[PDB]
Amino acid sequence: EVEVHGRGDIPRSSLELFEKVAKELGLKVERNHRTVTVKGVSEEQIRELEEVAKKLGLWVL
Amino acid sequence: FNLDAEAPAVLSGPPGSFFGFSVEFYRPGVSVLVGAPKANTSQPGVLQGGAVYLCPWGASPTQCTPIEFDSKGSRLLESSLSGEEPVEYKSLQWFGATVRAHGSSILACAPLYSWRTEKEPLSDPVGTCYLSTDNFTRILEYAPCRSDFSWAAGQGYCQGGFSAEFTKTGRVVLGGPGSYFWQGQILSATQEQIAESYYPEYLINLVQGQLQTRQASSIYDDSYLGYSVAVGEFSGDDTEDFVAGVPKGNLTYGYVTILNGSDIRSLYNFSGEQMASYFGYAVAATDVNGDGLDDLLVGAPLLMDRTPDGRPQEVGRVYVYLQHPAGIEPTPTLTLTGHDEFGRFGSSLTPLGDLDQDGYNDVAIGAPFGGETQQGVVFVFPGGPGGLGSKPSQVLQPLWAASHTPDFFGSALRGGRDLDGNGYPDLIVGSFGVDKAVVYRGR
Amino acid sequence: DYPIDLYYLMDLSYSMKDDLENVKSLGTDLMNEMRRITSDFRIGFGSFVEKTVMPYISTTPAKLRNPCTSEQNCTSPFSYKNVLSLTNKGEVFNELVGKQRISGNLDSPEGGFDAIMQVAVCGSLIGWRNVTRLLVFSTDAGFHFAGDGKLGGIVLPNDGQCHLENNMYTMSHYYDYPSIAHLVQKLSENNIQTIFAVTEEFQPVYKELKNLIPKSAVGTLSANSSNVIQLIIDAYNSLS
Ligand SMILES: *[C@@H]1O[C@H](CO)[C@@H](O[C@@H]2O[C@H](CO)[C@@H](O[C@@H]3O[C@H](CO[C@H]4O[C@H](CO)[C@@H](O)[C@H](O[C@H]5O[C@H](CO)[C@@H](O)[C@H](O)[C@@H]5O)[C@@H]4O)[C@@H](O)[C@H](O[C@H]4O[C@H](CO)[C@@H](O)[C@H](O)[C@@H]4O)[C@@H]3O)[C@H](O)[C@H]2NC(C)=O)[C@H](O)[C@H]1NC(C)=O
Ligand SMILES: *[C@@H]1O[C@H](CO[C@@H]2O[C@@H](C)[C@@H](O)[C@@H](O)[C@@H]2O)[C@@H](O[C@@H]2O[C@H](CO)[C@@H](O)[C@H](O)[C@H]2NC(C)=O)[C@H](O)[C@H]1NC(C)=O
Ligand SMILES: *[C@@H]1O[C@H](CO)[C@@H](O[C@@H]2O[C@H](CO)[C@@H](O)[C@H](O)[C@H]2NC(C)=O)[C@H](O)[C@H]1NC(C)=O
Ligand SMILES: *[C@@H]1O[C@H](CO)[C@@H](O[C@@H]2O[C@H](CO)[C@@H](O)[C@H](O)[C@H]2NC(C)=O)[C@H](O)[C@H]1NC(C)=O
Ligand SMILES: *[C@@H]1O[C@H](CO)[C@@H](O[C@@H]2O[C@H](CO)[C@@H](O)[C@H](O)[C@H]2NC(C)=O)[C@H](O)[C@H]1NC(C)=O
Ligand SMILES: *[C@@H]1O[C@H](CO)[C@@H](O)[C@H](O)[C@H]1NC(C)=O
Ligand SMILES: *[C@@H]1O[C@H](CO)[C@@H](O)[C@H](O)[C@H]1NC(C)=O
Ligand SMILES: *[C@@H]1O[C@H](CO)[C@@H](O)[C@H](O)[C@H]1NC(C)=O
Ligand SMILES: [Ca+2]
Ligand SMILES: [Ca+2]
Ligand SMILES: [Ca+2]
Ligand SMILES: [Mn+2]
Ligand SMILES: [Mn+2]
Ligand SMILES: [Mn+2]
């Protein structure tokens, strides 16, 4: 699983975009307050999600 | 009552050094430890590293001398020399901002110390505490918040050592307000564990058996847990239990948490009364009513109250909770209110022991900006069968004339020790605004 | 008719990337609305993010230039910056509001209380007159107050004096955040009424703050700006 926090002084309009992109490839999504987490995706998928999260400025664990 | 302030002994440090930010006793030849956050140490490449001064009590001029806790400067980055780059930043680290001594063990913390992780060039103020054990035979480093979690989402901005305490059995307690996006954290470790797991070769060191709180959901962000720490027996066993302050926890109302002491599991919560009152700026635990069970005191300096006329003035308040044999009630048993506008009343509390020697413990409450000339003031409240008294038994004010800069008198207190040996406890008050530290003795 | 003076305090932390358009629309709607009920008024605006010290911002040399992500550009942080003094020519106000850019920061709360204190105290520089004064405060985040600065090594309480140099706040690193009582006293002395145009999510906390500060109102910030506009109208019509 991948935890994408994005809880600092960053817009909520970027984090939401992540939830869109994750929903675009048809996989899991779980949202807590100002946090999202996606479960057990793949190797290439984890690379892609990490790249997008970095590009939008979110901290990805 | 019996606290002679005709001519207190006054210790003077270097100018422009915040001498007296934190004070403590040390009796392994009794002596007084004082801090100096902005002190010019002799270690190379360090600017205003800060230090501690061990003033040996007894000498006629009590000429304070510093303690060489660390002589090496900022450590070079490994494999960077293979120009060089500092792996840490000791400049303006505020070393000595918290000094606590138990037995022959000394603990001096540095909250503002920041280091650059090897993996990424980011910088984060982890903060470190140096622990000198068995007098000064060996001195170890303790950085419980310098873990592998790098950024602010981890323990990177934890600023451990911002508050610290020793328990009865020598267990070391630290509080890091900035951990997990300023959620706060309480870390605990015995000295023996630190010594066993000590390994200076590696910067990242995991102390086995360490107790700490875990990361909570994003609801509780910016709580500043661990802003102030204390100890006391509340559960009912022989193990001392932690007390932590959360000034901005519940919608900036703040609260105070009591912990299980052995598992760090929340036991009691005490909520604030007014928004943005900083309820939890300083906490203390002592047996005010002499029942044999520790009682809680919580300060809030920014609390405002309506004047009789109606104008809202900032005074500050102190809440006192008495621990009945059954349990500790969530309604403050007694509240003390300040009387000086912008006085910051209750920003530092300290138990004093049986100063009056009548069978009840007494308390001392500071006010950095009270008094006629806004120099500072300290109030001494007595105990009794009904609890804490409502009227200040004794008032202490600085002797020297006011300067053009605040004196911050009473911003750091410590008491409950028989410094001279006359059989009564003594008090020590910090005045770092003009770099002073005064000592009052019992009669 | 009564004369009126209004000053617009904008938040420009990185969390405003989703709200910048709403703030600009609110500015260009305050101007074109209050130029219809009073006919004699002056407005100006300012901006703020946070103090520039060790904990509140990233002190690494790379992030000082671009506190935001590497993809976006952003401008370096600034504690407070009075950009336009009070004036009546609306074209200047519109053109200056339309060119604002966002800035970065680390911690979620923003230090707007320094900006409020400086606006309240620095009278001649901003251009306050002996006339009913209004202050609209737009924010997407919480707020600091006294006691936070001790994290960054700042312990001197905010003295409440005017320290503006070259239309910029220069004593951010030297003074603590003002406590709530200090703001209450200064606003009550200067005869300034505050209207918080905060985002919906922070409605509760600011509403509680509305209890502490006398003669203050709280609306909501969105594309439909009508709430704070009607608050302005209500405040104007209640004068006597
Ligand atoms: C005093 O006041 C403080 C706060 O001011 C109180 O502390 C709060 O206590 C409450 C409960 O009383 C906590 O809320 C609950 O927390 C957990 C959530 O899981 C947590 O604990 C787990 C313990 O094993 C742990 O696994 C979790 O770790 C998670 O970490 C992250 C989450 O971000 C995630 O990535 C991991 O995978 C883990 O999931 C985490 O630490 C839980 O009990 C509750 O949520 C559950 O609620 C029900 C359960 O019946 C269920 O239906 C839900 O689906 C959900 O699972 C709830 O959130 C709160 O977190 C505490 N806050 C703080 C700051 O510590 C304290 O209790 C007060 N004391 C007193 C005496 O009143
Ligand atoms: C415990 O140590 C103190 C402090 O001295 C420290 O430890 C020394 C070994 C050395 O590293 C010093 O620089 C440290 O400050 C001893 O008290 C006196 O310390 C002063 C200097 O602060 C020194 O000049 C005196 O000689 C010390 N006193 C004596 C009697 O030697 C203290 O004595 C030590 N306790 C013991 C030995 O039981
Ligand atoms: C520590 O020492 C340094 C010099 O080694 C001091 O820096 C200078 O201090 C003098 C006064 O001694 C000032 O006039 C200069 O402007 C300072 N230069 C700087 C800051 O670049 C420093 O102030 C000392 N710190 C103390 C005494 O706390
Ligand atoms: C957070 O603080 C609020 C404000 O004090 C608390 O709400 C209070 O709740 C108590 C009972 O629990 C009531 O007596 C008060 O009147 C309430 N105050 C207000 C202003 O409504 C709230 O309980 C606190 N939350 C937690 C989790 O401690
Ligand atoms: C404080 O912590 C101790 C340590 O966990 C708790 O003692 C435990 O109590 C439970 C029963 O409640 C026993 O099953 C455990 O074996 C005990 N552990 C030890 C080592 O004594 C104690 O209950 C906690 N006190 C509280 C919750 O107030
Ligand atoms: C930001 O814009 C300026 C415009 O002058 C440009 O020079 C600079 O390279 C840009 N920086 C980034 C990080 O995009
Ligand atoms: C407002 O009144 C004050 C107080 O007398 C005075 O100093 C100031 O010049 C006056 N300003 C105007 C514009 O009349
Ligand atoms: C805003 O909402 C109100 C709701 O009554 C509506 O009348 C008004 O036309 C709306 N204005 C905008 C900005 O569209
Ligand atoms: Ca216990
Ligand atoms: Ca008791
Ligand atoms: Ca007594
Ligand atoms: Mn923001
Ligand atoms: Mn937003
Ligand atoms: Mn911020």
Size of interface B-C (CB pairs under 8 A): 78
| d(C-alpha B398, C-alpha A33), whole Å | 50
Query: Contact, B336 vs B381, CB < 8 A?
Result: yes
| d(C-alpha B231, C-alpha B242), whole Å | 5
- Ligand 7 neighbourhood includes C130 CB (under 6 angstroms): yes
Is C108–A14 a contact, with Cβ atoms under 8 angstroms apart?
no
Near ion ligand 14, which residues have CB within 5 Å? A 9; C 50, 105, 107, 110
| d(C-alpha C141, C-alpha C80), whole Å | 16
Closest CB to C18: pick one of A8, A11, A56.
Answer: A11
Is A9–C108 a contact, with Cβ atoms under 8 angstroms apart?
yes
Q: Name which residue sits closest to atom 6 of ligand 7, judged by CA.
A: C130
Percent helix, percent strand, percent coil in chain C, to nearest 5: 35, 20, 45
C132: DSSP letter = E
| d(C-alpha C83, C-alpha C45), whole Å | 6
- φ/ψ of B62, rounded to 5, equals 40, 60
Helix (H, G, I), strand (E, B) or coil at B86: strand
Is A32–B152 a contact, with Cβ atoms under 8 angstroms apart?
no
Residue recorded with tokens 């500071």: B366
CA angle B113, B115, B116 (to 5 degrees): 160
Q: What is the DSSP string of B174-194?
A: EEETTHHHHTBEEEEE-HHHH
What type of residue sits at position C83? V
Q: What is the distance in angstroms between the Cα of A40 and the nearest Cα belonging to chain C?
A: 27
| d(C-alpha B361, C-alpha B97), whole Å | 28
Nearest chain A Cα to C109, which residue? A9
| d(C-alpha B287, C-alpha B289), whole Å | 6
Ligand 14 center to residue C51 CA distance, Å?
8
| d(C-alpha B117, C-alpha B120), whole Å | 6
What type of residue sits at position B229? V
Is B112–C180 a contact, with Cβ atoms under 8 angstroms apart?
no
Is C153–B37 a contact, with Cβ atoms under 8 angstroms apart?
yes
Q: Judge whether A8 is closer than 8 Å to chain C, CB to CB.
A: yes
- With CA atoms as reference, report the closest residue to B160 among B111, B206, B202: B111
Top mutation candidate among B255, B271, B319 for ligand 4, by most atoms within 8 Å of CB: B271
Strand order in the sheet with B268-271: B229-232, B241-246, B255-258, B268-271
What type of residue sits at position B3? L
Q: Judge whether A11 is closer than 8 Å to chain C, CB to CB.
A: yes
Query: Contact, B125 vs B157, CB < 8 A?
Result: yes
Q: What is the distance in angstroms between the Cα of A42 and the nearest Cα belonging to chain C?
A: 26
Distances (CA, A) of B55 to B13, B25, B245, B437, C67: 10, 10, 31, 10, 45
- With CA atoms as reference, report the closest residue to B160 among B175, B172, B149: B175
- With CA atoms as reference, report the closest residue to B154 among C66, A58, A59, C59: A59
> Residue positions of B in the annotated binding site?
215, 222, 233, 235, 237, 239, 241, 287, 289, 291, 293, 295, 354, 356, 358, 360, 362, 418, 420, 422, 424, 426
Distances (CA, A) of B177 to B158, B348, C177: 6, 18, 18
- With CA atoms as reference, report the closest residue to C186 among C137, C123, C96: C123
Q: Are strands B394-396 and B413-417 parallel, antiparallel or unpaired?
A: unpaired
Q: Judge whether A10 is closer than 8 Å to chain C, CB to CB.
A: yes
| d(C-alpha C43, C-alpha C5), whole Å | 6
Residues 204-263 of B with CB under 8 A from C: 221-222, 247, 251-252
Top mutation candidate among C226, C227, C231 for ligand 8, by most atoms within 8 Å of CB: C226
- Ligand 4 neighbourhood includes B252 CB (under 6 angstroms): no
Ligand 9 center to residue B100 CA distance, Å?
21
Strand order in the sheet with B317-321: B282-286, B295-300, B317-321, B334-337
Ligand 1: nearest atom to the Cα of B217: 33
Two tokens, residue B66: 């510093």
- With CA atoms as reference, report the closest residue to B277 among B255, B294, B262, B297: B255
Ligand 8: which residues within 6 Å by Cβ? C 224, 226
Q: Judge whether C229 is closer than 8 Å to chain B, CB to CB.
A: no
Two tokens, residue B323: 């621990």
Is B153–A61 a contact, with Cβ atoms under 8 angstroms apart?
yes
Query: Contact, B209 vs B251, CB < 8 A?
Result: no
Which residues in A23-44 are b (16+ Cβ under 10 Å) and which e?
Answer: eeeeeeeeeeebbbbbeebeee
> Which resolution, in Å, applies to this structure?
3.4
* Residue B420 CA neighbour count, 13 Å, CB half: 13
Two tokens, residue B94: 């505020």
- With CA atoms as reference, report the closest residue to B293 among B246, B258, B345: B258
Q: Which chain B positions have a beta carbon within 8 Å of C155's beta carbon?
A: 408
- With CA atoms as reference, report the closest residue to C160 among C184, C178, C135: C178
Query: Contact, C44 vs C85, CB < 8 A?
Result: yes
| d(C-alpha A7, C-alpha B179), whole Å | 13
E strands, B96-199, where? Answer: 98-102, 105-110, 114-116, 123-124, 128-133, 138-142, 163-166, 172-176, 185-189
- Ligand 3 neighbourhood includes B441 CB (under 6 angstroms): no
* Helices and strands, counts by H and E, chain C: 8, 6
Closest CB to B247: pick one of C107, C147, C179.
Answer: C147
Nearest chain A Cα to C106, which residue? A9
CB within 8 Å of B74: residues ≥ 6 apart: B45, B46, B86, B87, B88, B89, B90, B91
CA angle C226, C232, C233 (to 5 degrees): 85
Q: Which chain B positions have a beta carbon within 8 Å of A8's beta carbon?
A: 152, 181
Is B153–A7 a contact, with Cβ atoms under 8 angstroms apart?
yes
CB within 8 Å of B144: residues ≥ 6 apart: B160, B174, B187, B189, B207, B210, B212
B243 bridge partner residues: B230, B258
CB within 8 Å of C230: residues ≥ 6 apart: C219
Query: Contact, B439 vs B419, CB < 8 A?
Result: yes
| d(C-alpha B254, C-alpha B270), whole Å | 9
Distances (CA, A) of B179 to B125, B157, B224: 10, 6, 8
| d(C-alpha B220, C-alpha C159), whole Å | 32
C15 is in an annotated binding site: yes
Ligand 3: nearest atom to the Cα of B47: 1
Two tokens, residue B289: 């009513």
Length of chain A as a residue count: 61
Handedness of CA C123, C128, C133, C134 (dihedral sign): negative
